[PDB]
Amino acid sequence: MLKAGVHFGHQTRYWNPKMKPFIFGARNKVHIINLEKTVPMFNEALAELNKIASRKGKILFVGTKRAASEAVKDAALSCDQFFVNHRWLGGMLTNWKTVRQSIKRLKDLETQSQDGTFDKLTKKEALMRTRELEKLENSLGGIKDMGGLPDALFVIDADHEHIAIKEANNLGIPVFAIVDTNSDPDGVDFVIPGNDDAIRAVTLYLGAVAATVREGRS
Amino acid sequence: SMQDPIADMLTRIRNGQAANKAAVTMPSSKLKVAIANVLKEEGFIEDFKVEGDTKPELELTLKYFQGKAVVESIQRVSRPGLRIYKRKDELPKVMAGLGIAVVSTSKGVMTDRAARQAGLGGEIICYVA
Amino acid sequence: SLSTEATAKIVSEFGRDANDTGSTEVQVALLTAQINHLQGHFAEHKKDHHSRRGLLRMVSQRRKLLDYLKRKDVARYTRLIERLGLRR
RNA sequence: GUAAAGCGCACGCAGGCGGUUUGUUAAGUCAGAUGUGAAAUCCCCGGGCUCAACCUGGGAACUGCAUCUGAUACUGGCAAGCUUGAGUCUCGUAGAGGGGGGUAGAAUUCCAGGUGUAGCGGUGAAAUGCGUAGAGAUCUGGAGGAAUACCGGUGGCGAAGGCGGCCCCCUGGACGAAGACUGACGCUCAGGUGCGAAAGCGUGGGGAGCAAACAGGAUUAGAUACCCUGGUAGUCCACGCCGUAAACGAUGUCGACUUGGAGGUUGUGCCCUUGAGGCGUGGCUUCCGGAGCUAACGCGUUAAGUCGACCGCCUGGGGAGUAC
Ligand SMILES: [Mg+2]
Ligand SMILES: [Mg+2]
Ligand SMILES: [Mg+2]
Ligand SMILES: [Mg+2]
Ligand SMILES: [Mg+2]
Ligand SMILES: [Mg+2]
Ligand SMILES: [Mg+2]
Ligand SMILES: [Mg+2]
Ligand SMILES: [Mg+2]
C-alpha cells in the first residue's frame, strides 16, 4: 500500500528465464515483479549504500536512457556524487588512466569562459572550442569530480548501461542495479527487481538512493 | 532408466545441480533410497523422502554451499557389462579421501571408509566428490 | 486391419475370462488371423512391400509372444499352438 | 557433423544388456581359514668380503587355482506377484505410405481437310532446317503417349530409397482419448533375410516430349564442347537382374535427465463455446538461442549438453578402394 505501488510490472513476454524468482506472476500480457521478494532488496541494497556512504566513498549513477538522463542529476549531482546520464565512454572505469586525460581539457576548457580568457582568438574560434564543452561537460561533466575509481556503482537499467556494469565487475567495483524482467541480473551483485522504466519508478527510487547516501556519512 | 535405474539416479542428481535446481524426483528403489541414505549422512544432500505405497517416487533435495553447488562431482563405475568388485584392500579413495565412494557390502550400502573400517569388501557403486 | 465382428469375436474364444483383450492366448491368436487373411492379399499385388513390412511385424511380434508362453506355462503353449494349427 | 571414421535402410537368430516387490538359493561377489603357488630374481630390514659390485639370514610378495566355514547388499538362478516399459482391445483423426484397376482436363506431336500467302524457325549474330509440291499462322475432325498447372506450404506420409489430378478395390504404419485387458512378454543385434534413386542388363511390349550416340550448321588458333537444326538407345509398361549415389542431417538404434522465445501441422479437454476466436494438454516439425559442449564453424530439449545399453567404424598422404 506504500509508494512501491508504481513499478508493479514491465517488459512483456520477452522476459529472461533468469529473472523468475522475482516474478509475482504473469498476467495480462506482461508479468509482475513480486514486491514481497522486492522488500528485502528495497533496503538490503540501500543499507550497504548507507553503510558505504559513511566511509566517504563514491557512487556513480548510470542512466544513459533519455527518460532518466535529465532526471538523474538532482539525485546524484545535487546530492554531490557521481553520475553518467549519457553514452558511457569505453573505459571510464578500466582505461580511466587515458580517459581522465579528456577530463583535463574539459576543466581547463571551463576556465576559458570563467575569466576574460574566453575573449581570445577569433569569435569563430571560441565557437569551435565551446562545442567541446557541450560534448565534454556532457559525457564527463558529471564525473569530472572523480579523482579515482569509485567504491560502488549504482546503475538504473541493467540492460542499457550494459558496458558500464561490465567494466565494473572487472575492477572490483560493487554494483547496485535495478534490473528488470528482460534484464540480465547475473552481472549485478545487488539486484533490485523493479520497473527499469516508468517515469515515476526511476525518480522515486533514484531520489530515494541519494536519501540514504546523503546522511550516509552521518 | 529402463536398463540402468541406478546410473539414472546419479545423472538426475548431477543434472539437477547444474541447473541449480532445488529438488530432484524419480522412481524409487531399494538400492536407490539406500544410496540416497548414504549421501544424506555425508552431508551431500539436505534430506529425502518418497511417495506412493504402490507407485513409489523418490524425492531428493539438492545442496550448495556458496555461489557454486556442493555435489560438484558424481559418476558411476560398476555399470552393467562392466561391473566392478573390489576387496577390503582395493577400495578406491575419491579425491585423496575428501570425496566418498558408495559400495554395497554384505552388510549393506556403505562408503569407501565405512566398509574399510569394517574390514570387508563389496561391489563399487559410484564416486562422489 | 480387421473387422470388429471378428476381432471382438475371437477374443471371446481364447480369453480365459471375459473381454480379456490383453491375454496372450487371445492377442497371439488374434494375430494369426490378420496374418493368414493377408496371405491371400499378398498372393496378389506382390510388389506391395510397405504392407508386408507390417505383415512381418505382426509375424515376429507373434513369435515374441509364443516364446513368452513357453517361458510362463509350458502347457498353455502346446495347448494353443494346436487350436491355431500353428508350427506348420 | 566438416580433420581418418555411422553400414543406404529395415527385420531378426546367436550374443551382450534388463522395470519393481517379497521369499528363497548362495553361482558371481565379500570375509576367514587350509592347501599350493620350487629355489633363485624383485622388494624391506639386517649380516660378510677394507667399499661396491658380489655373497647372505629372515620376512614381504608371488596379484593365481582349489577346498572348507561363513555373509546376503548388489548381479545371477527358482517361486509368487506388481504396473509405469512393451503389447492387445474400443472409438476417432490426418496423410502425395504401398499394390491393382479405372477415369478427366490442359498442352505437345503427328494424320486428314478448310481459310490464306511468302515467309517461318533459330541465334549474340548467323547458318543447317522447313516453305510456292503452299510452310508458318489460323480453324475443324482424328490418332497417341507422357506428365498431372492452380491448391503447394518454411506442408504431409514413409525405415530408407521415395511418394502429388479425380474415383473405386486390397493393404501398412503413426497419433489422441475416456478407458478395459496382458503382465517385463523389453533394448540392441555379428552372421542371416528382405527392401534399394538414377544409369545399366534380358525377354516382350510401347514410343508424344525429351535426349548419351551419331549427323549437319556456328563459334574458335583449334572446338572430337558449350550454342543451333535433327536424332537412336533410353526415358514409359510387364516380368526378372544389377545393387551403387554428395543413398547426406556427410550426425547408428533405444531410454532418462537439463533455462527460454517466435512459428508450422495434426488430436483432445475446457471457456458468456456468444468470435476470427481464449486457456490448457499430447504427436510430428521449422527458425532464433542460454548453460554446456566444440579446434573453430557452430550444435543447443528433434543436442554435437549430462548419462546408460548394444552395434558398425577410424588409426598419416600417395600408391589404392587398386592388385591377387
Ligand atoms: Mg573432405
Ligand atoms: Mg571425413
Ligand atoms: Mg544413415
Ligand atoms: Mg619363490
Ligand atoms: Mg536377486
Ligand atoms: Mg519421419
Ligand atoms: Mg530404371
Ligand atoms: Mg529395357
Ligand atoms: Mg541454435
From Swiss-Prot, chain A:
Family designation: Belongs to the universal ribosomal protein uS2 family.
Name recorded for this polypeptide: Small ribosomal subunit protein uS2
Alphabetic keyword roster: Ribonucleoprotein, Ribosomal protein
Keyword Transmembrane part of the UniProt annotation: no
Modified residues (N6-succinyllysine): 107
NCBIfam families (UniProt xref): rpsB_bact
Biological process terms in GO annotation: cytoplasmic translation; ribosomal small subunit assembly
Subunit structure: Part of the 30S ribosomal subunit, contacts bS1. Some nascent polypeptide chains are able to cross-link to this protein in situ. In collided ribosomes contacts ribosome rescue factor SmrB.
Statement: the UniProt record of this protein carries the keyword 4Fe-4S: no
Gene Ontology CC entries for this record: cytoplasm; cytosolic small ribosomal subunit
Domain of life: Bacteria
Pfam families in the record: Ribosomal_S2 (PF00318)
GO molecular function, one term: zinc ion binding
Function: Required for ribosomal protein bS1 (rpsA) to bind to the 30S subunit.
Swiss-Prot record, chain B:
UniProt-listed SUPFAM superfamilies: Ribosomal protein S8
PROSITE patterns hit by this protein: RIBOSOMAL_S8 (PS00053)
Domain of life: Bacteria
GO MF annotation list: rRNA binding; structural constituent of ribosome
Pfam families documented for this protein: Ribosomal_S8
Stored InterPro entries: Ribosomal_uS8, Ribosomal_uS8_CS, Ribosomal_uS8_sf
Entry annotated with the keyword rRNA-binding: yes
GO CC, one annotated term: cytosolic small ribosomal subunit
GO annotation, biological process: cytoplasmic translation; regulation of mRNA stability; regulation of translation; ribosomal small subunit assembly
Family the UniProt entry places it in: Belongs to the universal ribosomal protein uS8 family.
HAMAP family given in the database record: Ribosomal_uS8_B (MF_01302_B)
Protein name: Small ribosomal subunit protein uS8
Organism: Escherichia coli (strain K12)
Swiss-Prot record, chain C:
Superkingdom, natural source: Bacteria
Protein keywords: Ribonucleoprotein, Ribosomal protein, RNA-binding, rRNA-binding
Cellular component GO terms held in the UniProt record: cytosolic small ribosomal subunit
SUPFAM superfamilies to which the protein is assigned, alphabetical: S15/NS1 RNA-binding domain
Gene Ontology BP term (one): translation
PANTHER family, alphabetized: RIBOSOMAL PROTEIN S15, BACTERIAL AND ORGANELLAR, SMALL RIBOSOMAL SUBUNIT PROTEIN US15M
Function: One of the primary rRNA binding proteins, it binds directly to 16S rRNA where it helps nucleate assembly of the platform of the 30S subunit by binding and bridging several RNA helices of the 16S rRNA. Forms an intersubunit bridge (bridge B4) with the 23S rRNA of the 50S subunit in the ribosome.
Protein name per its UniProtKB record: Small ribosomal subunit protein uS15
Organism, as annotated: Shigella flexneri
Native organism taxonomy: Bacteria, Pseudomonadati, Pseudomonadota, Gammaproteobacteria, Enterobacterales
Gene, per the UniProt record: rpsO
